[PDB]
């Protein structure tokens, strides 16, 4: 009715404060709202997609506008290695005088924040040189956000709402996505690179007024049409190019030298355009696959129904998977989040391994922040994929449709899967903790020579097979006169070998026993998080303790204290438990990356190689040592520009600590406390005339777990980000 | 002159806008059928 949860009649009649909390918390759960049909659900999701896309482009336009208005892009272009990039200007009426002088840094004269997101290098590579270019990009993205908001409004109109058959058109949507949204966009980016970014790297000034009359190549469409495509690769940029200017430059637009530009320590811009062109052609061909309207093409139902091994090896094969995926939005979303989590972990690895933006791998602060950023986001997406698979099992899985399916057999032998994940996790934890404690006791007792240090020969063999030639394995690419080393010897090999065998890059960092131990720790974390998530997903439909768990839904508090006790029995509680393990393993990964790069950037990799084998070495050489510039941001003798990072460090500590409130103390204590406070307010004079509308009650059990988990996570992020930024900023190496 | 816009917009937005939104949201919460 007129009450706030208009979508839930059950919540609107709640006389307590639980109504507001649950109405806020269940606003986006479009499947369970009152009187919801499938078509209306799909239309609302389409409109929400448009609104979210507009939010993304508004955020990017805001970044562009703030760098254009309050930034030092003009000064940073002229000297990228010595000028600090600027995020935006600071307005604070709470500042003292010394805070105003302390935050006044860079070339500007106002208090200011130094950008650690690397947007300066990215825009500098793609041809931005002035503040007007950034402002025009901000205007374009503002107009795009306006257009997307209008489109979202338009597709909820009665004559423009698409039908349910339009949404479930898998072949047409995948054809158009794979061809257009991937290949045509990659082709357009290759065109932008060749027309603007490559000439800007060579000193030419190409903008909207002269791009249509300036030839990107001296010949121009003659090597392409005649078939002499190798003319575009001749005369590349020499190894004296000096980015942004024209001395030692070339006239090539599509090359595959491989390796790094010698000055910017990033990949060649002509390699990237060639890469994008190849990906464009491949994606257009791949989008030419599924039957839409012209006879040719596949049917996705027939491919899935055909793939049955001959004699019952996988049951009934993939029969019925087409009907389950199309009719369940939770399975599609789970597949999307799993793939996106793999993708953003891949970008996290490859942007430090193979930097593409000019004059990165020398800032080190953007280099740390981007990696930690993308790894934490990867962990979040990975947990969400399994959470939505559990939701799909709870309220979207049809057992009769999936009879003897490849999906039902997963539930058939779920006990074997959970038990073997248990065995792997227990084995890894036992052994890597035993090795770490052994090294701790051996170093503590004055005998570091008694440590168990396993040399990581498999990954070192992989590095040698990629071309690294200090391990002395002499195999494949590391050994000349080999088939792999000869076949590519005149396309991309010399640049790759001169980039992999130098000590200034992050390509295939030299690894020792500490790398072995911490990789085993990472495998432990991955296997245990997978254990919790897979067990929750597979036991979401029921177990021995609760055979009818599907009747109670995905998220419910418990099943009472009977038959032993049923605390944390739902699949939502399995998500809640696996969130801690994801945070733990991402913290392990980021600690390993940050300490290894802190020792490599300072030219002191021996410190990591000697102190990473035992836990006290970590504790006293990474965390205790690198906190000194952070915690000294403000003290009894004054303050500097890292005072905000010290304050945020303590802030994240306090939020992480007050999560333990909701995680350890449970409802009953607080409900009785609330009842005493209710008596207090009702029975005091003057103040009893002020009467509440909603009866105050304690937070519910699932709500309390969510609030404590959100506190734990926010405190986790807000205590790791200031450390990983200020410790790198406080050392410059 | 664009040196006035922080000191104008930041208090207006950050203080005045969410206060009115909190009051409006509370009123919309407590209205009934």
């Amino acid at each position: 009715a007129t009450k706030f949860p208009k979508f839930s009649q059950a919540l609107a009649q709640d006389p307590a404060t639980r109504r507001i909390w649950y109405g806020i918390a269940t606003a986006h759960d479009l499947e369970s709202h009152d009187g919801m049909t499938e078509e209306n659900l799909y239309q609302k999701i389409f409109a929400s997609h448009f609104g979210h896309l507009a939010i993304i482009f508004l955020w990017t336009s805001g970044n562009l506008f703030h760098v254009a208005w309050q930034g030092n892009f003009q000064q940073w272009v002229l000297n990228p290695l010595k000028v600090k990039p600027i995020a935006h200007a600071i307005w604070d009426p709470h500042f003292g005088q010394s805070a105003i002088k302390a935050f006044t840094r860079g070339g500007v004269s106002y208090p200011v924040n130094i950008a650690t997101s690397g947007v300066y290098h990215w825009w500098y590579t793609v041809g931005m040189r002035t503040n007007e270019d950034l402002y025009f990009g901000a205007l374009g993205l503002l107009v795009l956000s306006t257009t997307l908001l209008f489109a979202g409004w338009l597709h909820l109109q009665p004559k423009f709402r698409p039908g349910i058959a339009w949404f479930k058109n898998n072949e047409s949507r995948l054809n158009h996505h794979l061809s257009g949204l991937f290949g045509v966009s990659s082709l357009a980016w290759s065109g932008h690179l060749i027309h603007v970014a490559i000439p800007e790297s060579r000193g030419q000034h190409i903008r909207w007024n002269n791009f249509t009359s300036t030839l990107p190549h001296p010949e121009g469409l003659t090597p392409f049409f005649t078939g002499n495509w190798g003319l575009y690769a001749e005369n590349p940029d020499t190894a004296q190019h000096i980015f942004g200017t024209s001395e030692g430059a070339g006239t090539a637009i599509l090359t595959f030298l491989g390796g790094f530009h010698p000055q910017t320590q990033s990949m060649w811009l002509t390699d990237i355009a060639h890469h994008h062109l190849a990906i464009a052609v491949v994606f257009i061909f791949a989008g030419h696959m599924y039957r839409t309207n012209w006879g040719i093409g596949h049917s996705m139902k027939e491919i899935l129904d055909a793939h049955v091994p001959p004699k019952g090896r996988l049951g009934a094969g993939h029969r019925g998977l087409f009907e389950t995926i199309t009719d369940s939005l939770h399975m599609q979303l789970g597949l999307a989040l799993a793939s996106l989590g793999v993708a953003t972990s891949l970008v996290a690895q490859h942007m430090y391994a193979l930097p593409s933006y000019a004059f990165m791998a020398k800032d080190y602060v953007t280099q740390a922040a981007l990696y930690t950023h993308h790894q934490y986001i990867a962990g979040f997406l990975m947990v969400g994929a399994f959470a939505h698979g559990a939701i799909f099992f709870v309220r979207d899985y049809d057992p009769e449709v999936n009879k003897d399916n490849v999906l039902a057999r997963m539930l058939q032998h779920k006990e074997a899967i959970i038990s073997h994940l248990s065995w792997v996790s227990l084995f890894l934890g036992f052994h890597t903790l035993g090795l770490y404690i052994h090294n701790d006791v051996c170093v503590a007792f004055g005998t570091p020579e008694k440590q168990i240090l396993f040399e990581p020969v498999f990954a070192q063999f992989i590095q040698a097979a990629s071309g690294k030639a200090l391990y002395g394995f002499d195999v494949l690419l590391s050994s000349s006169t080999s088939a792999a080393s000869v076949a590519s010897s005149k396309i991309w090999l010399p640049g790759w070998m001169e980039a992999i065998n130098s000590g200034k890059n992050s390509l295939f960092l030299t690894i020792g026993p500490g790398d072995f131990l911490v990789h085993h720790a990472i495998a432990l974390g991955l296997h245990t998080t997978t254990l919790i998530l897979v067990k929750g997903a597979l036991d979401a439909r029921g177990s021995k303790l609760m055979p009818d768990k599907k009747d109670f839904g995905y998220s419910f508090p418990c099943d009472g204290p009977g038959r032993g006790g049923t605390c944390d029995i739902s699949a939502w509680d399995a998500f809640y438990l696996a969130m801690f393990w994801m945070l733990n393993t991402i913290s392990w990964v980021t600690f390993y990356w940050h300490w290894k790069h802190l020792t490599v950037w300072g030219g002191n990799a021996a410190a990591f190689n000697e102190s990473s084998t035992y836990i006290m070495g970590w504790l006293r050489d990474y965390l205790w040592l690198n906190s000194s510039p952070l915690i000294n941001g403000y003290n009894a003798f004054g303050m500097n520009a890292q005072a905000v990072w010290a304050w945020m460090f303590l802030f994240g500590h306090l939020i992480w600590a007050t999560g333990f409130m909701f995680l350890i103390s449970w409802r009953g204590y607080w409900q009785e406390l609330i009842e005493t406070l209710v008596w207090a307010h009702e029975r005091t004079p003057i103040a009893n005339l002020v009467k509440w509308r909603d009866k105050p009650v304690a937070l519910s059990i699932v709500q309390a777990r969510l609030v404590g988990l959100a506190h734990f996570t926010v405190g986790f992020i807000f205590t790791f980000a200031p450390f990983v930024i200020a410790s790198t900023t406080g050392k410059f190496a | 002159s664009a040196s006035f816009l922080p000191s104008i917009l930041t208090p207006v937005v950050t203080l005045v806008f969410p206060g009115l939104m909190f009051a409006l949201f509370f009123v919309l919460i407590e209205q009934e059928e």
């Binding site: 929400s48 208005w69 306006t146 908001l149 | 816009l5």
Partner: peptide
């Protein structure tokens, strides 16, 4: 250097985007 007229033009575009955002949010409605 970004002139004041450019900033006010961007503010006008953002205001139009705000009105369309209100329209979309009230088309999904509560």
């Amino acid at each position: 250097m970004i002139t004041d007229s450019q900033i006010f033009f961007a503010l006008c575009i953002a205001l139009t985007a705000a009105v369309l955002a209100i329209g979309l949010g009230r088309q999904l409605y509560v």
